[PDB]
Amino acid sequence: MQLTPFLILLRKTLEQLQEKDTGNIFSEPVPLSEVPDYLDHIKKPMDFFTMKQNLEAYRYLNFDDFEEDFNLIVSNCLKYNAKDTIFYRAAVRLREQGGAVLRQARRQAEKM
Numbered sequence: 286m287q288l289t290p291f292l293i294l295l296r297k298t299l300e301q302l303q304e305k306d307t308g309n310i311f312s313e314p315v316p317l318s319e320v321p322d323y324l325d326h327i328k329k330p331m332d333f334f335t336m337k338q339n340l341e342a343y344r345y346l347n348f349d350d351f352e353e354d355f356n357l358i359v360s361n362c363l364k365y366n367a368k369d370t371i372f373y374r375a376a377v378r379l380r381e382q383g384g385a386v387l388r389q390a391r392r393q394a395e396k397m
Protein backbone atom coordinates (compact mmCIF):
# COMPACT_ATOMS: atom_id res chain seq x y z
CA MET A 286 0.00 0.00 0.00
CA GLN A 287 1.99 2.89 -1.44
CA LEU A 288 2.28 6.42 -0.11
CA THR A 289 2.31 8.30 -3.42
CA PRO A 290 -1.18 7.22 -4.64
CA PHE A 291 -2.54 7.81 -1.14
CA LEU A 292 -1.33 11.42 -1.14
CA ILE A 293 -2.69 11.92 -4.66
CA LEU A 294 -6.06 10.76 -3.33
CA LEU A 295 -5.88 13.12 -0.35
CA ARG A 296 -4.96 16.00 -2.67
CA LYS A 297 -7.95 15.25 -4.91
CA THR A 298 -10.23 14.86 -1.89
CA LEU A 299 -9.00 18.16 -0.44
CA GLU A 300 -9.71 19.86 -3.79
CA GLN A 301 -13.22 18.39 -3.77
CA LEU A 302 -13.80 19.64 -0.23
CA GLN A 303 -12.58 23.13 -1.13
CA GLU A 304 -15.02 23.09 -4.07
CA LYS A 305 -17.89 22.83 -1.57
CA ASP A 306 -16.63 26.07 0.03
CA THR A 307 -17.91 28.34 -2.73
CA GLY A 308 -17.47 31.49 -0.63
CA ASN A 309 -13.90 30.44 0.25
CA ILE A 310 -14.58 31.22 3.91
CA PHE A 311 -12.82 28.00 5.00
CA SER A 312 -9.85 28.05 2.62
CA GLU A 313 -7.51 30.33 4.62
CA PRO A 314 -6.89 30.85 8.34
CA VAL A 315 -9.54 32.97 10.06
CA PRO A 316 -8.04 36.46 9.64
CA LEU A 317 -7.28 37.38 13.24
CA SER A 318 -7.40 41.03 12.13
CA GLU A 319 -11.17 40.78 11.73
CA VAL A 320 -11.83 38.32 14.57
CA PRO A 321 -9.45 39.33 17.39
CA ASP A 322 -11.12 37.15 20.05
CA TYR A 323 -11.14 34.05 17.83
CA LEU A 324 -8.45 32.15 19.77
CA ASP A 325 -10.15 32.80 23.13
CA HIS A 326 -12.13 29.55 22.79
CA ILE A 327 -10.90 28.07 19.47
CA LYS A 328 -7.93 26.03 20.68
CA LYS A 329 -6.91 24.53 17.30
CA PRO A 330 -7.83 26.71 14.32
CA MET A 331 -7.96 24.88 11.01
CA ASP A 332 -8.58 25.71 7.35
CA PHE A 333 -8.02 24.19 3.93
CA PHE A 334 -4.74 26.01 3.29
CA THR A 335 -3.31 24.67 6.55
CA MET A 336 -4.58 21.19 5.65
CA LYS A 337 -2.72 21.44 2.33
CA GLN A 338 0.45 22.36 4.21
CA ASN A 339 -0.04 19.44 6.60
CA LEU A 340 -0.67 17.09 3.65
CA GLU A 341 2.58 18.03 1.90
CA ALA A 342 4.48 17.84 5.19
CA TYR A 343 3.46 14.14 5.36
CA ARG A 344 1.34 14.75 8.45
CA TYR A 345 -1.63 12.75 7.04
CA LEU A 346 -0.55 9.12 6.74
CA ASN A 347 -4.03 7.68 7.28
CA PHE A 348 -7.47 8.73 6.20
CA ASP A 349 -8.81 9.46 9.67
CA ASP A 350 -6.14 12.06 10.50
CA PHE A 351 -7.08 13.94 7.31
CA GLU A 352 -10.79 13.67 8.09
CA GLU A 353 -10.21 14.87 11.68
CA ASP A 354 -8.80 18.19 10.46
CA PHE A 355 -11.73 18.66 8.10
CA ASN A 356 -14.09 18.03 11.03
CA LEU A 357 -12.14 20.70 12.95
CA ILE A 358 -12.92 23.28 10.26
CA VAL A 359 -16.58 22.41 10.67
CA SER A 360 -16.66 22.21 14.47
CA ASN A 361 -14.63 25.40 14.94
CA CYS A 362 -17.18 27.27 12.83
CA LEU A 363 -20.21 25.86 14.67
CA LYS A 364 -18.55 26.70 17.98
CA TYR A 365 -17.51 30.26 17.23
CA ASN A 366 -20.50 31.58 15.27
CA ALA A 367 -24.06 31.99 16.53
CA LYS A 368 -26.70 29.63 15.17
CA ASP A 369 -28.53 32.39 13.30
CA THR A 370 -25.51 33.38 11.20
CA ILE A 371 -24.71 32.58 7.60
CA PHE A 372 -21.36 31.16 8.82
CA TYR A 373 -23.02 28.63 11.11
CA ARG A 374 -25.33 27.41 8.34
CA ALA A 375 -22.33 27.28 5.98
CA ALA A 376 -20.60 24.88 8.38
CA VAL A 377 -23.73 22.72 8.54
CA ARG A 378 -23.80 22.59 4.73
CA LEU A 379 -20.07 21.84 4.54
CA ARG A 380 -20.51 19.03 7.09
CA GLU A 381 -23.22 17.50 4.90
CA GLN A 382 -21.55 17.95 1.51
CA GLY A 383 -18.04 17.23 2.77
CA GLY A 384 -19.25 14.14 4.59
CA ALA A 385 -20.39 12.67 1.28
CA VAL A 386 -17.07 13.61 -0.35
CA LEU A 387 -15.17 11.91 2.45
CA ARG A 388 -17.25 8.72 2.38
CA GLN A 389 -16.57 8.26 -1.33
CA ALA A 390 -12.88 9.06 -0.89
CA ARG A 391 -12.52 6.54 1.95
CA ARG A 392 -14.11 3.85 -0.24
CA GLN A 393 -11.57 4.60 -2.95
CA ALA A 394 -8.69 4.47 -0.46
CA GLU A 395 -9.76 0.98 0.61
CA LYS A 396 -9.57 -0.20 -3.01
CA MET A 397 -5.82 0.52 -2.83
Ligand SMILES: CC[C@H]1Nc2ccc(C(=O)O)cc2NC1=O
Binds near residue numbers: 315
Ligand atom coordinates in the same frame (compact mmCIF):
# COMPACT_ATOMS: atom_id res chain seq x y z
C1 LIG B 1 -16.44 30.59 8.48
C2 LIG B 1 -15.28 30.03 9.30
C3 LIG B 1 -14.48 31.21 9.87
N1 LIG B 1 -13.99 32.06 8.76
C4 LIG B 1 -14.14 33.44 8.76
C5 LIG B 1 -13.57 34.19 7.74
C6 LIG B 1 -13.73 35.58 7.73
C7 LIG B 1 -14.46 36.19 8.74
C8 LIG B 1 -14.62 37.57 8.72
O1 LIG B 1 -15.25 38.15 9.63
O2 LIG B 1 -14.15 38.23 7.76
C9 LIG B 1 -15.04 35.44 9.76
C10 LIG B 1 -14.88 34.06 9.76
N2 LIG B 1 -15.45 33.28 10.77
C11 LIG B 1 -15.26 31.89 10.81
O3 LIG B 1 -15.80 31.26 11.72
